[PDB]
Amino acid sequence: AVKVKVXPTKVKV
Amino acid sequence: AVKVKVXPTKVKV
Amino acid sequence: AVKVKVXPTKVKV
Amino acid sequence: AVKVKVXPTKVKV
Amino acid sequence: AVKVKVXPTKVKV
Amino acid sequence: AVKVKVXPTKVKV
Amino acid sequence: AVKVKVXPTKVKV
Amino acid sequence: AVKVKVXPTKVKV
Amino acid sequence: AVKVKVXPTKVKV
Amino acid sequence: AVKVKVXPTKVKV
Amino acid sequence: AVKVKVXPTKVKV
Amino acid sequence: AVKVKVXPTKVKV
């Protein structure tokens, strides 16, 4: 899985 | 891969 | 996709 | 969306 | 509805 | 379905 | 929300 | 690295 | 991870 | 970050 | 720096 | 930006 930031939000998908 | 959406913003990772 | 909350974080996957 | 809880683990789907 | 896994448990919500 | 992780919290959507 | 069980699978929804 | 796609545009990061 | 722009969309991967 | 261009296709890294 | 693929072309930027 | 080439590989950075 990979760490991402989309807008203000970080998450790992 | 999967579409990620955060309010008005999207991308596919 | 579906809206989810994971820990404290909301996102749509 | 609806709260889901398995043992101690709460999330929202 | 969507297939999920919360803790050790798979189910559809 | 994909694992979604927020720090040490892991599930699957 | 309420605990539900089918034979093997329980979860609280 | 991971595929990233925005609308029609695919790349890898 | 690194800041990228793919089409019109800046994100971080 | 810098523009990266391959023929007509551009992005930024 | 990061490995990227821009169009058909891989490079590290 | 500037065109760079190495063996078979070119790109503009």
Contact between residue D4 and residue E13 where contact means Cβ atoms under 8 Å apart: yes
Q: How was this entry determined?
A: X-ray
Q: Which chains, if any, share at least 3 CB pairs under 8 A with chain L?
A: J, K
Enumerate the residues of chain H whose CB falls inside 8 A of the CB of residue B1: 2-3, 5
Report the sign of the C-alpha dihedral through residues B12, C4, C6, C9, in that order: positive
Inspect the interface and report whether the beta carbons of J6 and L12 lie closer than 8 Å. yes
Inspect the interface and report whether the beta carbons of K9 and L13 lie closer than 8 Å. no
- Name the 3-class secondary structure at E9: strand
| Count of beta carbons in the 10 Å neighbourhood of residue G8 | 6
Touch between G and J (at least 3 CB pairs under 8 Å):
no
Amino acid at A6: V
H13–chain I nearest CA distance, Å = 7
DSSP string, A1-13: --EEEETTEEEE-
Q: Which two tokens stand for residue G6?
A: 């089918």
* Order of all β-strands in the sheet with H9-12: G3-6, G9-12, D3-6, D9-12, C3-6, C9-12, B3-6, B9-12, H3-6, H9-12, K3-6, K9-12
Q: Which residues contact residue C9 at a Cβ distance below 8 angstroms, ignoring those fewer than 6 apart?
A: A9, A10, A11, F6
Q: Rounded distance, CA G10 to CA J5, Å?
A: 54
CB distance from E3 to chain F under 8 Å?
yes
Inspect the interface and report whether the beta carbons of H12 and K5 lie closer than 8 Å. yes
Q: At how many Å resolution was this determined?
A: 1.9
